[PDB]
C-alpha cells in the first residue's frame, strides 16, 4: 500500500487567514488525490477530488493544487466553519486506497 | 437527500462473528458501486471494502483479507458486510459509502452515519 | 582543465539494453478500477427478437 | 411525425415538490429511451436522467441524484419525471428527447418544446 | 463526469466563408461525440454523430471530425440560416453525458 | 483467514509428468496473482513460477523454463503447475504462494503446507 | 539472475540479545528486499519488505534497514520465540526472485 | 524442453527477398526477447539482430543494416526475419536464438537446429 | 540499402529563416545520432550538429552556435535542421550523415545525397 | 545568436549577501561551462569563477575563496553567484562568460551585457 | 565493433590434461565475456557467462576468469566429451556482439 | 579546434603506382582519425577509421598506419576508379570534428 | 598567480598607421594567451587565442605573434572603428586567469 | 443504425468463373448477416443465413464466411442462372435491420 503523510499534523488559525494543508506520498500517484473535511462527530465530506477539482456544493474558497507527491489544500480566507479535521485520500490504479492522519484546524 | 443507514453493530467477543446493514433509501442502488470504510478510534481513516455495481468483483484491505466478507443485495436495497474472526484491532466506527461515479474516480461522496462494532472483554 | 563537456561521446543506442519483459510487474487486479454500471448502457428494446408464436 | 408535449411546471418554493409529465404523440414510447435535458439560464446544457424502455434501469447525473424521481409508464403514451428537495439552481427550462436508438449512440433527435420550473421566493 | 469545453466561445463570421468550431475534451472519449445547433426560441437538433457520421436531413456543408480529446465541426459554406449556438455532447461509455458551454457564430 | 491447501504430490520416475493443485480458500482468489516457491532437501529457497490474475501473462525461472506450465482457473477458486521432464534436481517441498498485492512489491504472505514431490528410482 | 548472499551462515546467541543479519547482493538492487522467518516444520511468514518498512502484524523488535547492496535486519531484543531459519529475498524489477541460503539462530 | 526449428532457407540470386521463421515450441515467447546468429562456412560467428519483448525496439548489426527487418509475432508463437539484398557474403548457416533473461547479461541460452542459406547463381 | 534524401533547399536573403528534413528510409532511425555536414563551394568540409539517438543532448560547431538548431523526430523517420540569422559564409551544400554505431568512432557512413543552400540577395 | 542576460544586482552595505543570476538564451547551456568575469571601475579585469558543464568541479580565484559560491541550473538555463561577507574591493561590474570550447583554451568568446553591484553604507 | 580475439588458434591435448583458452578484447569489455562450446553438427552451447560464472547444468570442471581485456577458460581435467571448438563472446554495454574466431580441441 | 592539414594538396600519379597521402595534426589525436573519398558529384564514402582499421566493403588495396599527429594513408596499387579526393576527418575526445583540406588524385 | 604587465600604457596613433601591444608575463607561459579589445560602454571581443591563431569572424588585420614571456599584438592598418582598449589574458595550466591593465589606442 | 459496405459494386464474370463478393459492417455484428440474390423484375431471394447456413433449396455451389466485420459470399462454379444483383443483410440484436450497396454479376 502507501502510506499517505499530510503535515502539519495541527496548526492554528484565526477567521480570515489564509491557511495551507500539504499531503506528502510515499511514491507518485499522478493526480488521483481527494480531500476531505469531518466536523467532529459528523461523517467526513468531500471537497476536492482529482487533486484539482472542486466539488459541486462546496465554496470557492477551498482550493487544492499540486502533482507527483506534493498536494497542497489553499483556503483563501479561513471562515468560523472551516474548523475541522482534514484529511488527504488517494486512489491511484492498482494500490489499495489509504488516507492520512489528518490535519486539525484549531481557533485562535 | 440520499442517506445510508447502518445497524447491526454492538459489542462481541474476539473470534465471534457479526452481520452489519446498509439499508439505502431514495439512492439508485443498482447503478452504484459502495464501499466500507473504517475509522479507528484514533481518528484515523481506513478503507476496506469495495463492490463492483452487480457484485462482479469485490476487493478489501490487506489487514482484512480472509476475514470479512461484503456482499449487495439489489433487490431489497441494502449493503451487507459479515464479519468473522474479528481481533482488538476491529474497535471502530463503521462507516458507509457511496462511490462518486466519476470515470476513473473513486471518491466517496454520501458518506452513511456510522454503526460502531466494538470486540473487548 | 576542460571544463566543457564532451562533443564526442558516444550518442547511438545501447543495442545490449535488457531485451526482455519485467519478472516482477505488478500482478494482481486493480482495486481502483470504475466499479459503477454504464450509464450509457443501449436503454432501447430489441427490435431483432423472434416475432413468431 | 413526432412532437414531444411536456407539462406540469410553474414556480415553486425551494424544498417543495413538483411534477412535469412528457405526454407523447405518434413516437413508439415503449421501444425507446426518453432522456430529460435541463437548461440553465446560463446557457448550458445538462444532461439530468435517462429511463430504459420498460423502466428495468434508471440514471442519473450526479447533481439530480436522489432527488429526482424519472417514471416511465407505457400504456398512455407519456414519460414521468418528479421533481423533489429542489434549491435555486434546478431554475431552467427542462426539455424532454428521445434517444436516436443506435447500438451504441446516446443522441437526441426529437427534442421537446421545454416546459420552465421557477425555483424562487 | 468530463468537462467538456468547446472553443472559440464567440466568433463572427458572413455568409459564405468557411468556418470550424472544435470542442475540447478533458479525458478520451475516444469517437463518441454528437454535435447540436441551437436557433434562439428552439431546442438543439443534432447535426453529426459518432464525431463524423452526418445525421439524416442534415446538409453536407456540415461536417465532423477528430479522435481522442481533439474534434472539429467543419462548415463548408457558412449560409444565413447557419446562425446560432452550436454545442458539443459526449457519450463515453461507463461516464455521464455533458454539453459544451455552446459557440455562438454572429453575422458579419 | 485464508489457508492455502495443496495436493497431488508423491513419487515419480524421472521424466514422468506430475499435475498439482493449490485449491484455495476464504480467499478472493480471481483478484490476485499467485507464485509457486521451491525449498530444496538443502534448506535453500528457490522461486519457480508466477500466473497474473486472470492468466495473461506467466513467468518462470530458468530453471524450469520449458518444462514447467503453471494455469490459473478463477471458477473453482484453485491453482495449478503441470510439471514435464522432471529430474533428480526437482525433488523438494513445493509451497503455494499468493502475492501481497502491493504496488511494486513482490512479496508471500499466505504460504500454502507444502506438498512434496520425489523424483528418484 | 541476482545472488542473495547473507552473512553470518549461522549466528548462536541468548534470549534478551540483539542480533544483525547482513544481506550481501552480487549487483544493486535499490530498496526492494524481504526479510521471511522460517520456522522448521512451518512455511516461512513475511516480516519485512520494501527492505525498511515493518509488516503487519510483526513485532516492532524487528529492525531492517540499509541500499543497494548492503542490507540488515536488526533484533532489538532477542525473544524465546524468535529462533528460527532467516532468509534475504529480492524482487528487482526485470531480475528473477532468489532466495539466500537462509542463517540459522541456536539457542546460547 | 523448448526447442526453436527454423526454416524457409533454400537458393537465391544476390538481390531477391527471403523469408526466415523461428517457430518455437513450448517456450513462453513473449516475455524472452531473440536474436539471430550467422554462421558463415568458414566457422565464424556473427551476431545479426535482436528484437525486444514487445517488438518496440530493433538493433542491427551495420553489416546488415537496412536490409534485414526482423518482426516478431507473439499470437502465433513464431519469429519472423526477412531479407533483402543479398549477396556473397549472406551465404551461412543461420540460427535462432534466445536470450537468457538476465538483468544486463546478452548470452544465449537456447539456441535453434538452423536454416541453411545460399546465395549463388 | 538506407538512403537518405534531403530537402528544404533554395536561395534566401541573409538575416531569414529556413528548414531543412533528412526523411530516412529503411534505416532504424532510432537507434542512432545523427550529424549534419557542410560542404563549401571551395570544397572544404565541416561539421555541423550531432543530436543523439532520442534528443537528449546535441552539440553544434562554435560557427554554428545559436543561429542553427537541430531537431529529430523519431516517430516520423526524419531529421531536422532550423537555421536563423544567415549569411554568406552558409551558403554551401548541406550533407545529412549517420554515426556509424561504433563505441567511440564518431565516423559518418551513410551520408545523404545534399541539399544546396544559397544566401544571397 | 546568443545573448546572456544578467540581473540581481545594487547596492548593500559590506557583510551582506547578494545573489547574481545569468540566465542564458538560443545557447545549449548545459554543454558549455561558464566563467564569471569582473570589471573593476579602474578599468581592469580579474576573473572570479568557473563551473564545469555538470558541476562536478569549481575554481575560484584566490580574492574570492570562500566567500563566492558559485552554483548551474541546466534546466534552468542559468548561472548563479552567490556572495557572501562582501567587502569594499567587490564594488566592480561583474560579466557572465562562455567558455569557447576548445580543448586547452579558456578563452571567452560570448560575455554578457554586464551588472553593476556596489558595496557601500 | 569490438574485435575478438582467441588464442591459439588450435591446441591439442590428451584426456586427463589441463589447457588454457584465452580471449584478447580490442578495448575493455569489463567482464561481460561468455564462452561457447560447439561441437560438430550442433548449434554452440553456453558455458560461462559474466567472464567466470558458471551456467545451470554444466559441469564444474569448466572455470572462467580475467578482467579487462584478457580472459582465460581453463577445462581442470580434459574429459572424452569436451573436444569441440569455442567461441568467447562478449556483450558490452553499447557495443555489438562479436564473437571469437574460435579455438580447436585436438585429440592428441 | 584542431585544424587539419593534410599534404601534399595534389599528387598525379598513373595506374598501377603507390601514392601516399599524410594527414598532419595540430595537436595530438591518439588515433582518432577517419579517412574519405569523394568521387565528384558524390557525397564522400568512408575507407578507414581509427586511423588503422579497413571499413567494410572497401577494397584491400587501401591501408592506414600512423598515431599522435602523422597519420598516413597508402594506396598499394592505384586503380583507374580510385581517382577522387581525399579527406582526412579527427573524432578526438572533448574537441570537435574537423575535416582537411582535400588531397585530389590526378591522372599521369 | 602570474602577473601580466602590457607595455605601452597608452599608445597614441592615427589612421593608416601601424601599431604594436607588447604583453609580458612576469613567468613562462609557453603560447596559451588571448587577446581581447574592449570598445567603451561594451563587453570586451575576443581577437586572438593561443597567441597566434585569429579568432572567427577578426578582420585579418590583427596579427598575433611570441611566445613564451615576450608576445605582442599588431595591427597591420589601423582603422577609425579600432580605437578602443586592449587586455591581454593568460590561461596557463595549474594556473589561475588573470587579465592585463589594459592599452588605450588615441586618435592622432 | 449499422451500415455494410458491399465491394465491388459490380464484378462482371464468366460461366464456371469463381467469384467471391464481401460485405464489410461498420461495426462488429457476430454472425447475424444474411445474403440475398435479387434478379430484375422479382424480389430478392434468400440465399445465408447466419452468414455461413444454406437455405433450404438454395444450390449447394453458394457459401458464406466471415464473422465480425469481414463477411464473405463466394460461389464455386457460375452458373448462367446466377446472374443478379446480390445484396447483404444485417440482423445485429440492439441494432435496427438495415441493407447493403450491391454487388452485380454481368456476363463477360
Known amino acids: 500500500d502507501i502510506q499517505m503523510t499530510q503535515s502539519p499534523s495541527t496548526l492554528s488559525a484565526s477567521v480570515g487567514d489564509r491557511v495551507t494543508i500539504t499531503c506528502r506520498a510515499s511514491?507518485?500517484?499522478?493526480?488521483?488525490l481527494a480531500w476531505y473535511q469531518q466536523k467532529p462527530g459528523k461523517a467526513p465530506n468531500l471537497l476536492i477530488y482529482?487533486?484539482?477539482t472542486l466539488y459541486r456544493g462546496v465554496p470557492s474558497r477551498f482550493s487544492g493544487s499540486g502533482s507527483g507527491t506534493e498536494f497542497t489544500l489553499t483556503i483563501g480566507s479561513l471562515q468560523p466553519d472551516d474548523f475541522a479535521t482534514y484529511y488527504c485520500?488517494?486512489?491511484?490504479?492498482?494500490?489499495?486506497?489509504?488516507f492520512g492522519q489528518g490535519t486539525r484546524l484549531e481557533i485562535k | 437527500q440520499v442517506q445510508l443507514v447502518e445497524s447491526g453493530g454492538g459489542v462481541v467477543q474476539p473470534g465471534r462473528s457479526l452481520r452489519l446493514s446498509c439499508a439505502a433509501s431514495?439512492?439508485?442502488?443498482?447503478?452504484?458501486?459502495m464501499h466500507w470504510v473504517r475509522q479507528t478510534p484514533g481518528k484515523g481513516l481506513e478503507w476496506v471494502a469495495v463492490?463492483?455495481?452487480?457484485?462482479?468483483?469485490?476487493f478489501y484491505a490487506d489487514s482484512v483479507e480472509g476475514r470479512f466478507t461484503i456482499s449487495r443485495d439489489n433487490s431489497k436495497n441494502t449493503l451487507y458486510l459479515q464479519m468473522n474472526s474479528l481481533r482488538d484491532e476491529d474497535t471502530a466506527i463503521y462507516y458507509c459509502?457511496?462511490?462518486?461515479?466519476?470515470?476513473?474516480?473513486?471518491?466517496?461522496?454520501?458518506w452513511g452515519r456510522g454503526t460502531l462494532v466494538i470486540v473487548s472483554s | 582543465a576542460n571544463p566543457n563537456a564532451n562533443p564526442n561521446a558516444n550518442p547511438n543506442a545501447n543495442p545490449n539494453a535488457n531485451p526482455n519483459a519485467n519478472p516482477n510487474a505488478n500482478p494482481n487486479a486493480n482495486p481502483n478500477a470504475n466499479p459503477n454500471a454504464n450509464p450509457n448502457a443501449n436503454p432501447n428494446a430489441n427490435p431483432n427478437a423472434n416475432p413468431n408464436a | 411525425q413526432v412532437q414531444l408535449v411536456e407539462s406540469g411546471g410553474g414556480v415553486v418554493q425551494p424544498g417543495r415538490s413538483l411534477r412535469l409529465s412528457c405526454?407523447?404523440?405518434?413516437?413508439?414510447?415503449?421501444?425507446?429511451?426518453?432522456?430529460?435535458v435541463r437548461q440553465t439560464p446560463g446557457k448550458g446544457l445538462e444532461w439530468?436522467?435517462?429511463?430504459?424502455?420498460?423502466?428495468?434501469?434508471?440514471?442519473?447525473?450526479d447533481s439530480v441524484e436522489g432527488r429526482f424521481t424519472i417514471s416511465r409508464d407505457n400504456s398512455k403514451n407519456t414519460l414521468y419525471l418528479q421533481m423533489n428537495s429542489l434549491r435555486d439552481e434546478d431554475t431552467a427550462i427542462?426539455?424532454?428527447?428521445?434517444?436516436?436508438?443506435?447500438?451504441?449512440?446516446?443522441?437526441?433527435?426529437?427534442?421537446?418544446?421545454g416546459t420552465l420550473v421557477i425555483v424562487s421566493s | 463526469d468530463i468537462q467538456m469545453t468547446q472553443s472559440p466561445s464567440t466568433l463572427s463570421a458572413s455568409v459564405g466563408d468557411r468556418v470550424t468550431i472544435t470542442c475540447?475534451?478533458?479525458?478520451?472519449?475516444?469517437?463518441?461525440?454528437?454535435?447540436y445547433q441551437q436557433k434562439p426560441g428552439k431546442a438543439p437538433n443534432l447535426?453529426?454523430?459518432?464525431?463524423?457520421?452526418?445525421?439524416r436531413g442534415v446538409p453536407s456543408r456540415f461536417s465532423g471530425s477528430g479522435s481522442g480529446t481533439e474534434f472539429t465541426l467543419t462548415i463548408g459554406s457558412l449560409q444565413p440560416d447557419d446562425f446560432a449556438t452550436?454545442?458539443?455532447?459526449?457519450?463515453?461509455?461507463?461516464?455521464?453525458?455533458?454539453?459544451?458551454?455552446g459557440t455562438r457564430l454572429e453575422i458579419k | 483467514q485464508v489457508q492455502l491447501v495443496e495436493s497431488g504430490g508423491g513419487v515419480v520416475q524421472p521424466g514422468r509428468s506430475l499435475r498439482l493443485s493449490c485449491?484455495?480458500?476464504?480467499?478472493?482468489?480471481?483478484?490476485?496473482?499467485?507464485?509457486?516457491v521451491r525449498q530444496t532437501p538443502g534448506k535453500g529457497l528457490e522461486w519457480?513460477?508466477?500466473?497474473?490474475?486472470?492468466?495473461?501473462?506467466?513467468?518462470?525461472?530458468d530453471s524450469v523454463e520449458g518444462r514447467f506450465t503453471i494455469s490459473r482457473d478463477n471458477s473453482k477458486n484453485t491453482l495449478y503447475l503441470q510439471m514435464n521432464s522432471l529430474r533428480d534436481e526437482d525433488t523438494a517441498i513445493?509451497?503455494?504462494?499468493?502475492?501481497?498485492?502491493?504496488?511494486?512489491?513482490?512479496?508471500?504472505?499466505?504460504?500454502?503446507?507444502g506438498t512434496l514431490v520425489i523424483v528418484s528410482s | 539472475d541476482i545472488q542473495m548472499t547473507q552473512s553470518p551462515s549461522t549466528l548462536s546467541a541468548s534470549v534478551g540479545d540483539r542480533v544483525t543479519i547482513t544481506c550481501?547482493?552480487?549487483?544493486?538492487?535499490?530498496?526492494?528486499?524481504?526479510?521471511y522467518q522460517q520456522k522448521p516444520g512451518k512455511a516461512p511468514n513475511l516480516?519485512?519488505?520494501?527492505?525498511?518498512?515493518?509488516?503487519r502484524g510483526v513485532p516492532s523488535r524487528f529492525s531492517g534497514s540499509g541500499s543497494g547492496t548492503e542490507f540488515t535486519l536488526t533484533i532489538g531484543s532477542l525473544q524465546p520465540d524468535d529462533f528460527a531459519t532467516?532468509?534475504?529475498?529480492?524482487?528487482?524489477?526485470?531480475?528473477?526472485?532468489?532466495?539466500?541460503?537462509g542463517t540459522r539462530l541456536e539457542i546460547k | 524442453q523448448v526447442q526453436l526449428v527454423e526454416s524457409g532457407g533454400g537458393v537465391v540470386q544476390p538481390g531477391r527477398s527471403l523469408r526466415l521463421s523461428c517457430?518455437?515450441?513450448?517456450?513462453?515467447?513473449?516475455?524472452?526477447?531473440?536474436?539471430?546468429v550467422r554462421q558463415t562456412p568458414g566457422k565464424g560467428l556473427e551476431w545479426?539482430?535482436?528484437?525486444?519483448?514487445?517488438?518496440?525496439?530493433?538493433?542491427?548489426?551495420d553489416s546488415v543494416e537496412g536490409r534485414f527487418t526482423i518482426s516478431r509475432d507473439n499470437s502465433k508463437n513464431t519469429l519472423y526475419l526477412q531479407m533483402n539484398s543479398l549477396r556473397d557474403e549472406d551465404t551461412a548457416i543461420?540460427?535462432?536464438?534466445?536470450?537468457?533473461?538476465?538483468?544486463?547479461?546478452?548470452?544465449?541460452?537456447?539456441?535453434?537446429?538452423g536454416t541453411l542459406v545460399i546465395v549463388s547463381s | 540499402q538506407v538512403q537518405l534524401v534531403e530537402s528544404g533547399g533554395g536561395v534566401v536573403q541573409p538575416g531569414r529563416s529556413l528548414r531543412l528534413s533528412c526523411?530516412?528510409?529503411?534505416?532504424?532511425?532510432?537507434?542512432?545520432?545523427?550529424?549534419?555536414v557542410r560542404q563549401t563551394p571551395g570544397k572544404g568540409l565541416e561539421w555541423?550538429?550531432?543530436?543523439?539517438?532520442?534528443?537528449?543532448?546535441?552539440?553544434?560547431?562554435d560557427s554554428v552556435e545559436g543561429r542553427f538548431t537541430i531537431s529529430r523526430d523519431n516517430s516520423k523517420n526524419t531529421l531536422y535542421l532550423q537555421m536563423n540569422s544567415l549569411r554568406d559564409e552558409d551558403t554551401a551544400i548541406?550533407?545529412?550523415?549517420?554515426?556509424?554505431?561504433?563505441?567511440?568512432?564518431?565516423?559518418?557512413?551513410?551520408?545523404?545525397?545534399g541539399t544546396l543552400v544559397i544566401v544571397s540577395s | 545568436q546568443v545573448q546572456l542576460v544578467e540581473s540581481g544586482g545594487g547596492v548593500v552595505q559590506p557583510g551582506r549577501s547578494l545573489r547574481l543570476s545569468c540566465?542564458?538564451?538560443?545557447?545549449?547551456?548545459?554543454?558549455?561551462?561558464?566563467?564569471?568575469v569582473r570589471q573593476t571601475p579602474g578599468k581592469g579585469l580579474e576573473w572570479?569563477?568557473?563551473?564545469?558543464?555538470?558541476?562536478?568541479?569549481?575554481?575560484?580565484?584566490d580574492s574570492v575563496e570562500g566567500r563566492f559560491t558559485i552554483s548551474r541550473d541546466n534546466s534552468k538555463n542559468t548561472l548563479y553567484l552567490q556572495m557572501n561577507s562582501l567587502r569594499d574591493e567587490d564594488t566592480a561590474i561583474?560579466?557572465?562568460?562562455?567558455?569557447?570550447?576548445?580543448?586547452?583554451?579558456?578563452?571567452?568568446?560570448?560575455?554578457?551585457?554586464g551588472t553593476l553591484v556596489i558595496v557601500s553604507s | 565493433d569490438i574485435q575478438m580475439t582467441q588464442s591459439p588458434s588450435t591446441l591439442s591435448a590428451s584426456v586427463g590434461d589441463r589447457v588454457t583458452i584465452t580471449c584478447?578484447?580490442?578495448?575493455?569489455?569489463?567482464?561481460?565475456?561468455?564462452?561457447y562450446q560447439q561441437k560438430p553438427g550442433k548449434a554452440p552451447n553456453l558455458?560461462?557467462?559474466?567472464?567466470?560464472?558458471?551456467?545451470r547444468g554444466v559441469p564444474s570442471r569448466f572455470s572462467g576468469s580475467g578482467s579487462g581485456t584478457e580472459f582465460t577458460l581453463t577445462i581442470g581435467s580434459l574429459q572424452p566429451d569436451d573436444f569441440a571448438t569455442?567461441?568467447?563472446?562478449?556483450?558490452?554495454?553499447?557495443?555489438?556482439?562479436?564473437?571469437?574466431?574460435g579455438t580447436r580441441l585436438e585429440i592428441k | 579546434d584542431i585544424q587539419m592539414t593534410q599534404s601534399p594538396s595534389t599528387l598525379s600519379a598513373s595506374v598501377g603506382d603507390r601514392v601516399t597521402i599524410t594527414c598532419?595534426?595540430?595537436?595530438?589525436?591518439?588515433?582518432?582519425?577517419?579517412?574519405y573519398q569523394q568521387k565528384p558529384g558524390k557525397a564522400p564514402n568512408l575507407?578507414?577509421?581509427?586511423?588503422?582499421?579497413?571499413?567494410r566493403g572497401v577494397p584491400s588495396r587501401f591501408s592506414g598506419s600512423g598515431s599522435g599527429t602523422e597519420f598516413t594513408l597508402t594506396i598499394g596499387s592505384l586503380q583507374p576508379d580510385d581517382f577522387a579526393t581525399?579527406?582526412?576527418?579527427?573524432?578526438?575526445?572533448?574537441?570537435?570534428?574537423?575535416?582537411?583540406?582535400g588531397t585530389r588524385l590526378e591522372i599521369k | 598567480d602570474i602577473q601580466m604587465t602590457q607595455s605601452p600604457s597608452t599608445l597614441s596613433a592615427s589612421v593608416g598607421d601601424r601599431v604594436t601591444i607588447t604583453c609580458?608575463?612576469?613567468?613562462?607561459?609557453?603560447?596559451?594567451?588571448?587577446?581581447y579589445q574592449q570598445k567603451p560602454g561594451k563587453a570586451p571581443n575576443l581577437?586572438?587565442?593561443?597567441?597566434?591563431?585569429?579568432?572567427r569572424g577578426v578582420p585579418s588585420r590583427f596579427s598575433g605573434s611570441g611566445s613564451g614571456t615576450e608576445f605582442t599584438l599588431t595591427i597591420g592598418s589601423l582603422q577609425p572603428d579600432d580605437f578602443a582598449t586592449?587586455?591581454?589574458?593568460?590561461?596557463?595550466?595549474?594556473?589561475?586567469?588573470?587579465?592585463?591593465?589594459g592599452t588605450r589606442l588615441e586618435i592622432k | 443504425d449499422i451500415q455494410m459496405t458491399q465491394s465491388p459494386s459490380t464484378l462482371s464474370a464468366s460461366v464456371g468463373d469463381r467469384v467471391t463478393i464481401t460485405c464489410?459492417?461498420?461495426?462488429?455484428?457476430?454472425?447475424?448477416?444474411?445474403?440475398y440474390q435479387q434478379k430484375p423484375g422479382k424480389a430478392p431471394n434468400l440465399?445465408?443465413?447466419?452468414?455461413?447456413?444454406?437455405?433450404r433449396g438454395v444450390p449447394s455451389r453458394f457459401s458464406g464466411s466471415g464473422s465480425g466485420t469481414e463477411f464473405t459470399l463466394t460461389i464455386g462454379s457460375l452458373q448462367p442462372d446466377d446472374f443478379a444483383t446480390?445484396?447483404?443483410?444485417?440482423?445485429?440484436?440492439?441494432?435496427?435491420?438495415?441493407?447493403?450497396?450491391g454487388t452485380r454479376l454481368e456476363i463477360k
Open positions: 431514495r439512492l439508485t442502488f443498482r447503478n452504484f458501486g
Open positions: 459509502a457511496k462511490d462518486w461515479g466519476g470515470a476513473s474516480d473513486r471518491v466517496f461522496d454520501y
Open positions: 482529482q487533486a484539482s
Open positions: 511514491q507518485s500517484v499522478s493526480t488521483s
Open positions: 485520500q488517494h486512489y491511484n490504479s492498482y494500490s489499495r486506497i489509504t
Open positions: 463492490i463492483w455495481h452487480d457484485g462482479s468483483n469485490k
